[PDB]
Design a protein around this ligand. Sequence first.
Ligand SMILES: C[C@]12CC[C@H](O)C[C@H]1CC[C@@H]1[C@@H]2C[C@@H](O)[C@]2(C)[C@@H](C3=CC(=O)OC3)CC[C@]12O
Length: 122
Amino acid sequence: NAKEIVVHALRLLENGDARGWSDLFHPEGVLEYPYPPPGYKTRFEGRETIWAHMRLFPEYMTIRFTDVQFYETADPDLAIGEFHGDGVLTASGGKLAYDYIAVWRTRDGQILLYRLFFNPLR
Ligand SMILES: C[C@]12CC[C@H](O)C[C@H]1CC[C@@H]1[C@@H]2C[C@@H](O)[C@]2(C)[C@@H](C3=CC(=O)OC3)CC[C@]12O
């Protein structure tokens, strides 16, 4: 189910496995930053592109997430949840913090939609 897939993914990212995380997306699957920070795209259509975006992730930062607080949905293939992320820039130093809310949509064990809200000012 979606909640299962989401936790899996977040774990993969915590482990720095960006290809894995990427791989969890349906080929024509989409990543979105509804409130994108400046200098970044806001939609990433297709696994290849999502991968291209996330490729560099582990090189600049390492993240650790709080446990997702999901809200109960009807559809088991839709998950809506809030969670926090703390990052440490490989620079290094740089502690970086995020408070998310996301709408995940899955099918046959793959991620179709990853809509990740966060504060672009912050
Ligand atoms: C917007 C962001 C800001 C920090 C850094 O400059 C990289 C950019 C692009 C990549 C972006 C970070 C913030 C982070 O919170 C992210 C949203 C983070 C993610 C968490 C998640 O569940 O999906 C992606 C990993 C990296 C991230 O995807």
